[PDB]
Amino acid sequence: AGHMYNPRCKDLDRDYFPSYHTTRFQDQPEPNLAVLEHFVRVTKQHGRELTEKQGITVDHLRYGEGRQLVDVFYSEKTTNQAPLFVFVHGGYWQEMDMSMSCSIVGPLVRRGYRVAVMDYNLCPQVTLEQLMTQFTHFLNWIFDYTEMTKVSSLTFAGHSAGAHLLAQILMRPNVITAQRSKMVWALIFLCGVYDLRELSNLESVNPKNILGLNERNIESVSPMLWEYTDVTVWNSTKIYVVAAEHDSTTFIEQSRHYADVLRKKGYKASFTLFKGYDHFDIIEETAIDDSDVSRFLRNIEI
């Protein structure tokens, strides 16, 4: 009978771990471990190269306590009112940090963007609901920053758990006013997860319920299940829901389903399945200006 986003699923825990679904590293005895080892190593190298090789400047900022940090990258070519690209990393709300999250910066900076790569507190130090509240704080802080600095427009991208976190931007109208909404050129949801009801009961993904989920809050933390309202304030904003071809069926379907919920509600949203990519190299190749994913990002700017 399978599961909620994969009617032929043979192993639910495996369907929630994208590492098992790559076509890379098949010369290794455990390709899932090799993809993650490579991802950490190469993203860290991308982060170092921005200032060691590519002549990019970074401002190291703090927006809150703990891991509430944000690095803002630019160059000597960046204009005072340059648009801001905000990237929200993944890691299942429990791992990854800014050091693994800066692959995307270089080509954007070369095109005249300022890029904010943010970090956040992780579960279990915060519950998922507390992380979501801290992320509303981050959104308020980033819009104050862009208002102070007269930025021409904002684009937000989230990857994996970061795409989940980003989804609240559509439903926090006490912070995101209609004028703030109008400032958003695009929202990019890369390989997200939006319905947390299955994973909440997996010890693999949510060991010991570190995310702090229960039947009282499981809808609040699941963007798939929200009753979206005031959709017209977003009508100028382009929304891109993206999945990787070599992701699990549950991940691909969660993205197809979420794009369909946003389109039905009336958002300017599309679904894209990225051919030949897995859940990890869809971020690794954002460090290469002419890659397929880098060019997709460039084309959103046109």
Side-chain angles (χ1 to χ4, degrees):
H3 292 281
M4 292 180 79
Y5 296 93
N6 182 355
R8 292 162 284 268
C9 184
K10 306 288 177 276
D11 177 342
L12 189 61
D13 292 288
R14 180 173 165 272
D15 251 36
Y16 275 95
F17 282 92
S19 61
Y20 287 94
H21 298 90
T22 187
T23 55
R24 302 190 283 163
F25 294 105
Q26 301 306 116
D27 61 301
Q28 299 298 308
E30 312 187 68
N32 56 117
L33 299 189
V35 76
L36 298 173
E37 185 182 44
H38 173 90
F39 178 79
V40 167
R41 186 168 56 247
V42 301
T43 61
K44 280 172 175 281
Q45 182 172 314
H46 296 334
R48 295 185 324 261
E49 292 177 334
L50 297 166
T51 58
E52 299 181 350
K53 299 194 83 49
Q54 297 181 12
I56 283 173
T57 301
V58 61
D59 296 343
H60 292 116
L61 308 180
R62 179 173 287 277
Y63 75 92
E65 296 195 16
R67 286 169 52 118
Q68 287 173 289
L69 300 181
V70 60
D71 277 355
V72 179
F73 298 89
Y74 58 98
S75 71
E76 78 280 32
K77 312 177 186 191
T78 314
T79 70
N80 281 4
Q81 297 183 173
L84 185 67
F85 191 108
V86 180
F87 181 65
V88 186
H89 70 79
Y92 255 139
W93 319 282
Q94 51 205 98
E95 69 179 12
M96 297 298 104
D97 61 28
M98 191 175 294
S99 79
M100 296 157 212
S101 303
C102 293
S103 301
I104 198 154
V105 173
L108 283 162
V109 171
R110 289 179 282 273
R111 289 197 305 275
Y113 272 79
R114 279 189 205 271
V115 182
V117 181
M118 65 82 71
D119 218 332
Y120 46 91
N121 291 128
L122 301 176
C123 295
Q125 195 51 250
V126 286
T127 63
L128 182 58
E129 282 197 290
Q130 281 174 322
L131 174 42
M132 288 173 60
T133 294
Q134 294 187 341
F135 192 83
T136 308
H137 165 64
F138 171 70
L139 294 176
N140 189 45
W141 188 104
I142 212 63
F143 275 98
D144 279 352
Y145 179 97
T146 56
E147 283 158 4
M148 161 177 88
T149 67
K150 306 203 181 222
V151 155
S152 55
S153 75
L154 286 86
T155 288
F156 290 82
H159 178 229
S160 202
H164 168 268
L165 290 174
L166 178 61
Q168 72 164 247
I169 197 174
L170 299 183
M171 286 298 286
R172 296 292 181 273
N174 293 332
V175 178
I176 309 307
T177 53
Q179 177 44 34
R180 288 180 162 186
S181 289
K182 202 55 78 172
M183 294 300 290
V184 184
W185 179 258
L187 299 172
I188 298 158
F189 294 92
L190 303 166
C191 308
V193 64
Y194 310 97
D195 180 347
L196 272 63
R197 288 176 300 172
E198 301 182 304
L199 64 85
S200 73
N201 297 133
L202 294 177
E203 172 71 10
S204 63
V205 177
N206 182 22
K208 305 305 182 303
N209 198 20
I210 56 162
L211 299 175
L213 306 180
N214 50 60
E215 54 188 4
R216 303 151 255 148
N217 65 199
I218 191 62
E219 290 187 10
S220 65
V221 299
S222 295
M224 193 76 81
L225 314 183
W226 298 342
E227 287 313 326
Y228 289 89
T229 59
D230 283 326
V231 169
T232 70
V233 305
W234 291 99
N235 82 86
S236 303
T237 300
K238 301 193 296 188
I239 299 180
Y240 300 87
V241 180
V242 177
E245 179 177 15
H246 303 314
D247 215 332
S248 77
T249 294
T250 283
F251 269 74
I252 294 166
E253 287 291 322
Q254 284 228 24
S255 280
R256 287 192 190 279
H257 270 82
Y258 189 57
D260 281 347
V261 162
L262 293 186
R263 283 169 64 88
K264 189 49 82 169
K265 286 301 178 182
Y267 296 99
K268 198 171 38 155
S270 57
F271 180 68
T272 302
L273 186 64
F274 241 126
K275 182 172 167 175
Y277 276 100
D278 64 45
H279 193 90
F280 298 91
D281 63 3
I282 199 169
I283 293 302
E284 301 161 30
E285 289 194 15
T286 63
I288 305 292
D289 303 58
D290 72 330
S291 71
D292 276 339
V293 65
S294 291
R295 290 189 162 183
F296 170 87
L297 295 176
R298 171 260 270 158
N299 276 7
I300 287 174
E301 297 157 19
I302 61 98

